[PDB]
Ligand SMILES: *[C@@H]1O[C@H](CO)[C@@H](O[C@@H]2O[C@H](CO)[C@@H](O)[C@H](O)[C@H]2NC(C)=O)[C@H](O)[C@H]1NC(C)=O
């Protein structure tokens with residue numbers, strides 16, 4: 001017959017919301033943290 | 044992420060149909076391909092065949108191509124294998140596995156099923172015979188004692204023993220199943236418990252012969268002749 | 269704006285323009301009505317120079 005090549009990108013079954021400037025909410029593959037909210041609990 | 048639950052009868056009459064199902068949890072069944080894989084204990088394992096988890100377009104190993112028939116369901120997030128005219132040798136452990144979408148590619152069997160034992164029922168199915176084993180002077184180490192619980196006369200395999208329903212785990216050793224001259228299967232799951240606790244607690248070995256649905260929280264006690 | 273055999277006409281879209289205005293409306297809200305409360309400042313005018 002005739003061949004078809006078709007491009008694309010990966011996704012994740014489970015993602016996380018992220019705040020941007022374009023859209024206050026969006027879903028991306030892998031998130032991280034920029035705020036350490038937790039302590040060991042001793043000096 | 045992705046987990047699988049293997050299901051089916053671990054026993055089957057000779058020259059009969061094998062029916063198995065495995066579960067999916069997380070991801071979308073439509074977005075991958077899935078195969079099965081066979082392994083008798085302590086030998087080489089083998090790829091059975093795969094299907095379009097999206098469409099249903101399939102392949103099988105040439106050896107089992109006629110014998111093995113694999114299936115899927117979009118509805119229930121499940122998929123099946125149907126094997127006809129089974130051999131006595133075909134007795135093995137099975138798996139459900141995630142395969143890559145590409146018909147030819149690498150990274151095959153990225154994720155595996157928990158593993159379900161499948162034994163052909165050569166002899167009649169029967170209930171476990173739970174044999175307690177009292178610790179003696181000659182079965183106690185300085186720091187430990189040897190409480191035993193033999194599951195004999197049980198057919199077919201396996202039989203999984205819980206100790207205090209899995210309350211104690213330290214030095215609990217399930218000894219492998221034994222073919223006796225009886226032609227019957229048996230094993231003990233030995234428990235090592237400190238010597239200080241001797242003559243104090245009456246421990247329980249709990250039998251989980253899953254196909255027979257048997258629960259035997261049988262105790263081990265010292266008796267005098 | 270088309271130019272066909274029949275004549276010359278225009279038709280508006282709703283789909284793309286709705287997504288347009290939508291994204292603008294958010295940008296308003298993310299910058300409108302949002303506020304901080306300040307309850308006791310220090311004095312900001314000085315009648316005398318201490
Ligand atoms: C997602 O990306 C993160 C990048 O932060 C990866 O996380 C790594 O492991 C820890 C805990 O998540 C982080 O503190 C590190 O910054 C990361 N490792 C390094 C040294 O780069 C994570 O591997 C990614 N997750 C997946 C599975 O995609």
Ligand SMILES: *[C@@H]1O[C@H](CO)[C@@H](O)[C@H](O)[C@H]1NC(C)=O
Nearest residue numbers: 012013014015068069070071
């Ligand atoms: C992702 O995880 C969340 C929280 O467990 C769950 O509610 C959601 O259904 C999951 N989505 C997928 C696609 O697995």
